[PDB]
Each structure stands twice: as C-alpha cells, then as structure tokens.
Amino acid sequence: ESADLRALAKHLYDSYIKSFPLTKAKARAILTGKTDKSPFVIYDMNSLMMGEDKIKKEVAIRIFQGCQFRSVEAVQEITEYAKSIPGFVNLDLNDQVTLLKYGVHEIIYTMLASLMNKDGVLISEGQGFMTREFLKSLRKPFGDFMEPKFEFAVKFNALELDDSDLAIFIAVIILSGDRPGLLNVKPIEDIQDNLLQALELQLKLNHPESSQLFAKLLQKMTDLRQIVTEHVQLLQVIKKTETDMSLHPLLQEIYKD
Amino acid sequence: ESADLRALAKHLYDSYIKSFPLTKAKARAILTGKDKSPFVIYDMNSLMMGEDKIEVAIRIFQGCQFRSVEAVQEITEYAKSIPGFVNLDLNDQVTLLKYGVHEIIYTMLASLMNKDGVLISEGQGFMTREFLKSLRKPFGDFMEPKFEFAVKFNALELDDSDLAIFIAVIILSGDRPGLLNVKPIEDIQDNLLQALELQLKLNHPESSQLFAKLLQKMTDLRQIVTEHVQLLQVIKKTPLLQEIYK
Numbered sequence: 173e174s175a176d177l178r179a180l181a182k183h184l185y186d187s188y189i190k191s192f193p194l195t196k197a198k199a200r201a202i203l204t205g206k207t208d209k210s211p212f213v214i215y216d217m218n219s220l221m222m223g224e225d226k227i228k229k230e231v232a233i234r235i236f237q238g239c240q241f242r243s244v245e246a247v248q249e250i251t252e253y254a255k256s257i258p259g260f261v262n263l264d265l266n267d268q269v270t271l272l273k274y275g276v277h278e279i280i281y282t283m284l285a286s287l288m289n290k291d292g293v294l295i296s297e298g299q300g301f302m303t304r305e306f307l308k309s310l311r312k313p314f315g316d317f318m319e320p321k322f323e324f325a326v327k328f329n330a331l332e333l334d335d336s337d338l339a340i341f342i343a344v345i346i347l348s349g350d351r352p353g354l355l356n357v358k359p360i361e362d363i364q365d366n367l368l369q370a371l372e373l374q375l376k377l378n379h380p381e382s383s384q385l386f387a388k389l390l391q392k393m394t395d396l397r398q399i400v401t402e403h404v405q406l407l408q409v410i411k412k413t414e415t416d417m418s419l420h421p422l423l424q425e426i427y428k429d
Numbered sequence: 430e431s432a433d434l435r436a437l438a439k440h441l442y443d444s445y446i447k448s449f450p451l452t453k454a455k456a457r458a459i460l461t462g463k464d465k466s467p468f469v470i471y472d473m474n475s476l477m478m479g480e481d482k483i484e485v486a487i488r489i490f491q492g493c494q495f496r497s498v499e500a501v502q503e504i505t506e507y508a509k510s511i512p513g514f515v516n517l518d519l520n521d522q523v524t525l526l527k528y529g530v531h532e533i534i535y536t537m538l539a540s541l542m543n544k545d546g547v548l549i550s551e552g553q554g555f556m557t558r559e560f561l562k563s564l565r566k567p568f569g570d571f572m573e574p575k576f577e578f579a580v581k582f583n584a585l586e587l588d589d590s591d592l593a594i595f596i597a598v599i600i601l602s603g604d605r606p607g608l609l610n611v612k613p614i615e616d617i618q619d620n621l622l623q624a625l626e627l628q629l630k631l632n633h634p635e636s637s638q639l640f641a642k643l644l645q646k647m648t649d650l651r652q653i654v655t656e657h658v659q660l661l662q663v664i665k666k667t668p669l670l671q672e673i674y675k
C-alpha cells in the first residue's frame with residue numbers, strides 16, 4: 173500500500189527533524205537571505221580571529237580539530253536517527269555497529285552538503301559561514317580536505333532535495349547489506365527494500381517533474397563512497413606529518429576498517 | 430509510451446547479441462552443463478597444456494590485457510548502436526568510452542564467472558579461482574575481488590536482455606571528467622534508465638527493487654575499477670606492443 177510507505181516516510185522525516193538541530197530548510201534560509209539568521213563570515217585570518225568574539229595551537233589544526241569534534245557530534249545524532257529506523261534495533265548488535273561504522277561518514281558528507289553552497293560552508297550551527305577559499309588556503313596538507321566535499325555538494329545540491337527526501341535517503345544508506353563483516357545480510361536487505369520503496373514513492377510524489385530522480389539520487393552513493401576513501405587517505409597523511417595531533421577515539425574506532 | 434521503452438530494450442538486446450559473441454545465457458550453459466566441456470586450468474601443467482588446446486602470473490595477466498583490448502572494440506560497436514550516442518560531440522563519445530570501458534569489462538566478466546572460476550577464450554577454457562589466487566604477488570589478490578563482486582552481482586540473476594540496457598546506462602554517464610556537453614548524454618541516460626526500470630519490472634516481476642539494487646552495484650564497479658588501476662600502477666614497477674596495450 174502506498175499509504176504504508178507514506179507512513180514510513182512520515183515516520184522517518186519526523187525522526188530526522190528530532191535528531192538533527194540544523195535542517196536543510198534552516199540552512200537554506202540562512203544562506204538564501206531570509207536579517208536575524210545572518211552568519212558572520214570567515215574568509216581570512218583576521219575574520220577568523222574575530223569569529224570567536226561572537227561565534228562558538230595552530231590555525232589550520234584548530235579548524236581541522238573543530239571538524240573532528242563536530243563530526244563526533246554528527247555520529248551521535250546519526251546514531252540516534254538510526255535507532256528510529258524501524259527494524260535497525262532488532263538487528264544483531266554487531267551488525268548494528270558495523271552499519272553505523274560504514275554509514276556514518278557517507279551520511280555526514282550528504283548532510284554536510286545542506287550546509288554548503290559553491291562559495292562556502294556554514295559553521296557552528298549556522299552562526300558562522302566559512303568561505304571555501306579560506307579553507308582552500310589552509311597550509312598543506314590541510315588545504316584540500318574540504319575541496320572534494322564542496323564538489324560533491326554543488327553536484328548533489330543540484331538535485332534540489334528537501335529534508336523529507338533526505339531523511340529516507342540517509343536511511344537507505346545506513347541499511348546497506350553489502351557492508352564488510354555483516355553477519356546477517358538478509359534481514360538488512362529486507363529493511364532497505366522498504367526504505368528504497370519509501371524513497372521511490374516520496375521522490376515521485378515530492379518531485380513529479382524530476383524524471384529518474386530516484387536513479388539519479390542512487391548514483392550519488394558512488395560519489396559519497398569515493399569521497400570517504402579520499403578522506404581516509406588524507407587522514408593517513410595527517411597522522412604521519414602531525415604526530416602531535418590527537419584524534420577523537422570514536423572517530424578513531426570508525427576508521428578501523 | 431512504454432512501447433518506445435520496449436522498442437529501445439529490444440533494439441539494445443539485438444545489438445548486444447551481435448556485438449558480444451559469448452553471451453551470458455551461453456556462458457551460463459557452459460558453467461552449469463550443456464556439448465564439449467571447456468579445458469580446465471587449475472595447475473601449472475594445465476596452463477601449459479591449455480596453450481595447445483587453445484612467465485606465469487605475467488603471461489596470464491597479459492592475456493587478460495589482450496582480451497580487454499578485444500572487448501573495448503566490441504563495446505565500442507555496441508555503444509554506436511545506442512540511440513543518440515553517435516550524434517554526440519565526438520570528444521564526448523571518446524570520453525564516455527574511455528572511462529566506461531573498465532566498468533563494462535567487469536560487468537560482463539561477471540557473466541563469465543562463478544564462485545569457483547572464470548571462463549576464458551570465448552568459453553573454450555576455464556581457469557580456477559583457486560589457481561588464480563595462488564599466483565605470486567601482486568597478481569594473486571588481483572582477480573580475487575572480481576570474483577567477490579561477481580558473486581554478489583550474479584545474485585541479481587540478470588539476463589542478457591537486462592545487461593544490455595544496464596551496459597548502455599554505464600556508457601552514458603554524465604559525470605565522466607572532461608565532458609564538453611553533458612545535457613544530451615544525461616538526456617539519453619535518463620531514457621535508458623527508464624527503459625531499464627521497465628525491463629526489470631516486466632522481466633523480473635517478483636524481484637522487488639531490483640532496479641535499485643542494480644544501480645547500487647555501480648559503486649562496487651567504480652571501486653573495483655579504481656582498485657584495478659591502483660594495482661596497474663604497482664605492476665608498472667616490476668616494444669611496439671606497449672603501444673597496442675597502453
């Protein structure tokens with residue numbers, strides 16, 4: 173029944189709102205220009221220095237560390253979202269852990285896109301805006317840790333997806349049966365099938381003009397996966413150059429691979 | 430209506446059969462059973478005998494490279510059959526082929542594989558998965574991931590009629606770096622995706638979200654292709670012919 177699917181979609185969007193403080197709707201409202209939500213813009217070292225004044229070791233490091241802690245917060249939110257996904261909690265506790273481990277980053281980057289536009293990314297819950305150019309400036313190797321993400325974002329944001337659509341998509345991503353180490357694939361695959369179903373409908377209903385958005389959207393997983401692998405590599409390098417730099421344990425456990 | 434999509438699917442199927450000599454249906458008969466069994470290569474002597482029926486890991490690897498080249502031409506001719514593909518800016522065509530060929534090679538390679546091995550020489554022979562893995566590094570783990578991808582891919586239980594469209598979709602990928610005009614490519618891909626979706630519903634009505642699962646497979650493909658070149662670079666570190674193969 174279409175209604176059965178709609179109900180699932182409603183259930184997910186509702187969990188998504190509850191789980192994530194900064195929706196895409198809000199992020200867009202801040203970026204688009206709708207006088208009380210206006211972000212302080214960071215485009216240089218001075219502005220960065222000022223940013224602290226009102227916004228929430230070394231400059232490049234301090235920024236990199238800022239991301240790390242911020243991702244940890246994302247993992248917590250995503251993890252909370254996952255529990256809401258009908259079925260996920262019933263799954264064998266090991267796989268629950270495995271799906272999270274592989275999914276979390278792909279989701280982080282998908283959602284990160286909601287915060288981005290061609291020339292920058294929102295920071296500190298939307299209180300600030302860091303310009304792409306500044307990040308790109310950052311002393312090597314950090315200089316190009318956000319670059320790939322911006323490229324994905326601009327391509328992804330083009331689909332014009334709404335929080336409602338994303339909630340289901342993010343859900344599909346978590347429940348991927350082909351994740352290394354899975355003990356029970358079949359139970360996971362049946363959940364996804366439902367989600368894929370819920371998404372397929374949602375997109376059709378939400379984006380009637382958008383032909384094959386479902387397929388277009390599913391192809392993006394390729395780009396997400398591509399990004400993650402690039403990041404890991406970059407991380408490898410940073411750990412070697414910067415033996416001083418600490419990594420959050422949660423993040424460090426996910427990268428186990 | 431759907432008649433256009435069914436026309437496109439039939440057209441692609443017929444072109445696919447013409448372009449590709451050893452089909453999945455045909456490779457499948459050989460794997461399972463049904464005339465002359467292929468010559469089985471499982472050990473060194475079998476390889477040595479095999480040459481006569483039809484310097485180790487290297488000779489084997491070059492032969493895949495030789496066969497890849499052959500496929501590239503077979504894929505090209507097939508690509509040309511795809512409606513709109515020839516009309517495209519010629520630079521774009523060369524590009525879509527240049528970046529699509531590896532992905533398509535492995536897709537079809539899966540048609541030749543089963544959990545225990547892979548058919549070779551238009552099905553005249555069979556190389557064991559065990560023998561391949563054995564091969565000295567880095568050749569050993571080289572094939573091993575394809576088998577894994579194949580096993581998962583084959584589960585979808587696709588047929589030549591389904592792959593034909595699927596093949597087409599890969600070729601018309603609008604992301605490929607350096608494309609001069611994306612709109613028409615995407616526009617055609619969009620039409621292929623529609624055709625594939627319907628083909629899969631009609632052909633595999635019981636299968637739920639097969640279309641979706643097939644589309645997800647592309648991630649695997651790209652990772653495999655990325656791994657492949659990753660290994661190829663490493664090979665580089667260990668006359669005319671270099672040119673033919675490049």
Ligand SMILES: *[C@H](C/C=C/C(=O)/C=N/CC(=O)O)CCCCCCCCCCn1nnc2c1-c1ccccc1CN(C(=O)CCCCCNC(=O)C(F)(F)F)c1ccccc1-2
Nearest residue numbers: 227228234235237238239240241242243294295296407423
């Ligand atoms: C980053 C996107 C990253 C994607 C990745 O994949 C990253 N991977 C990392 C990895 O290792 O794999 C793009 C930018 C988005 C995040 C930017 C967030 C805002 C900027 C950093 C703010 N911040 N947050 N936590 C810390 C910092 C920070 C950064 C730089 C210098 C100093 C600090 C200070 N700091 C604090 O937490 C104190 C903040 C006081 C403000 C009051 N607090 C609040 O507003 C509230 F609401 F109560 F939270 C700090 C100290 C130590 C370690 C981290 C931070």
